[PDB]
Amino acid sequence: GEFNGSNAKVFREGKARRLRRRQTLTWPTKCACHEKEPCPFCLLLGRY
RNA sequence: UAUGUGAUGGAACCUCUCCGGAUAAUUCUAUCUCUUCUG
Numbered sequence: 037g038e039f040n041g042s043n044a045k046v047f048r049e050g051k052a053r054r055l056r057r058r059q060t061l062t063w064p065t066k067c068a069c070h071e072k073e074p075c076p077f078c079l080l081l082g083r084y
Numbered sequence: 085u086a087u088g089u090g091a092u093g094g095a096a097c098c099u100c101u102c103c104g105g106a107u108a109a110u111u112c113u114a115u116c117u118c119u120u121c122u123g
């Protein structure tokens with residue numbers, strides 16, 4: 037996935053913003069995942 | 085009743101300090117009671 041960037045505001049009427057503070061895990065990359073046919077993890081996340 | 089590519093809040097002991105204490109022989113004698121009718 038990506039797990040970066042984003043524009044979370046933790047509210048619709050305030051800036052504040054919501055961000056991570058811990059470490060994100062990794063796994064080796066296999067197959068092709070893109071906009072047309074996202075992998076199940078990206079489909080759940082909806083990063084595209 | 086959220087709004088979405090990002091939430092270690094299991095991420096914090098109502099904790100700390102303070103003699104239910106102090107004083108006292110289970111002992112012992114003076115009355116009580118008010119209206120009587122000329123005396």
Ligand SMILES: [Zn+2]
Nearest residue numbers: 069074075078
């Ligand atoms: Zn993917």
